[PDB]
Design a protein around this ligand. Structure first.
Ligand SMILES: COc1ccc(C2=NN(C3CCN(c4nc(N)nc5ccccc45)CC3)C(=O)[C@@H]3CC=CC[C@H]23)cc1OC
Ligand SMILES: [Mg+2]
Ligand SMILES: [Zn+2]
Length: 333
């Protein structure tokens, strides 16, 4: 399929990104994009550098050549939407790295499992089209029909897995080619399982199952590793509120635009439009983020940190302080 080539290849290798430390919890992807004419080659380099620097691809007989083909193969599959673009999955990959190596979550998993997670971040939203699963079902869209007929409500997540598998059948872009037997099976199994678990419809059930496993010393060990990978991918996804406020705010600008556009399309089609998707209300960013923090993200991070993931306490602290900063935008309005 397609083939990347040196033209695109080198176009990434000749980015050096001197101003930053990709390993830092305060790494700023917004700066990186802004700091060149080629934001797409910069993002790729950040992924490339993160993966190579972990020394995980080498360990699992993944050469640099195949690695970069893989990244680049994913990039093509991402579109140009406000939020669910290739910058979001590069973000997720970089954030997951910080949770593994600064939050010491590496200790709870094998190297293969850390390698799979870093990879899975990049395939997790392949060919996302700005539109949530709901839209596909309410518009009786062909992908919603296929999902509905096929027995799986996770319209996009199955889509992303399909594309991810595609990319890896080609061995010049197959970052698991060096795995054999049980390891290769696990890599695909867990990668798919993780991606499917990013469907926010399943958020409660996946959080309650990870916690019940974490509190049980007799939990099946393979099942705990798996749920931990699922929880970490989920964490990367909702990690925007754990960043430095200014980075957080810009993430929230991007999603708020993306939601607005779906809601524009939901008006045209004539289908139901939720409050959140409606440009008609200015819809105070502050109150949106405060609600997202109180109902989804603060309880999530606090609970997994306490159960198990004590190294990630900083996520709970930054949420707490990002919240207080939104309350001070309210108090001074
Ligand atoms: C930067 O800031 C955001 C980034 C991503 C998302 C994402 N949001 N969501 C939904 C998650 C659940 N929601 C709310 N639920 C419940 N119980 N209460 C709420 C109260 C107030 C607002 C929302 C909710 C709806 C949105 C996705 O599904 C995206 C796709 C995948 C993962 C997360 C994304 C939201 C952001 O800020 C609002
Ligand atoms: Mg997704
Ligand atoms: Zn995502």
């Amino acid at each position: 399929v397609t083939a990347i080539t040196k033209v695109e290849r080198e176009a990434v290798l000749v980015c050096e990104l001197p101003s930053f430390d990709v390993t830092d919890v305060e790494f700023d992807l917004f700066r990186a994009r802004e700091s060149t004419d080629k934001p797409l080659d910069v993002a790729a380099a950040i992924a490339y550098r993160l993966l190579l620097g972990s020394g995980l691809p080498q360990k699992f007989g993944c050469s640099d050549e195949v690695l970069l083909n893989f990244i680049l193969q994913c990039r093509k599959k991402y579109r140009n939407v406000p939020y669910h673009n290739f910058y979001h999955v590069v973000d997720v990959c970089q954030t997951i790295h910080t949770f593994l190596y600064r939050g010491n979550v590496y200790e709870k998993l094998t190297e293969l499992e850390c390698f799979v997670l870093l990879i899975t971040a990049l395939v997790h939203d392949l060919d996302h089209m700005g539109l949530n699963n709901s839209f596909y079902l309410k518009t009786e869209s062909p992908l919603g029909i296929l999902s509905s007929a096929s027995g799986n409500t996770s319209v996009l997540e199955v889509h992303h897995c399909n594309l991810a598998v595609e990319i890896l059948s080609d061995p010049e872009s197959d970052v698991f080619d060096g795995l054999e037997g049980a390891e290769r099976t696990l890599a695909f199994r867990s990668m798919i399982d993780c991606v499917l678990a990013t469907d926010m419809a399943k958020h409660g059930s996946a959080l309650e199952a990870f916690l019940a496993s974490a509190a049980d010393q007799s939990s099946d060990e393979a099942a705990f590793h798996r749920m931990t990978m699922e929880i970490i991918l989920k964490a990367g996804d909702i990690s925007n509120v754990t960043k430095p406020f200014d980075i957080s705010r810009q993430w929230a600008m991007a999603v708020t635009e993306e939601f607005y556009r779906q809601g524009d399309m939901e008006k045209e089609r004539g289908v139901e439009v939720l409050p959140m998707f409606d440009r008609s209300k200015n819809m105070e960013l502050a109150k949106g983020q405060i609600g997202f923090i109180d109902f989804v993200a603060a309880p999530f991070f606090q609970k997994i940190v306490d159960a198990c993931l004590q190294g990630m306490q900083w996520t709970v602290d930054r949420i707490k302080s990002n919240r207080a900063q939104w309350e001070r935008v309210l108090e001074t309005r």
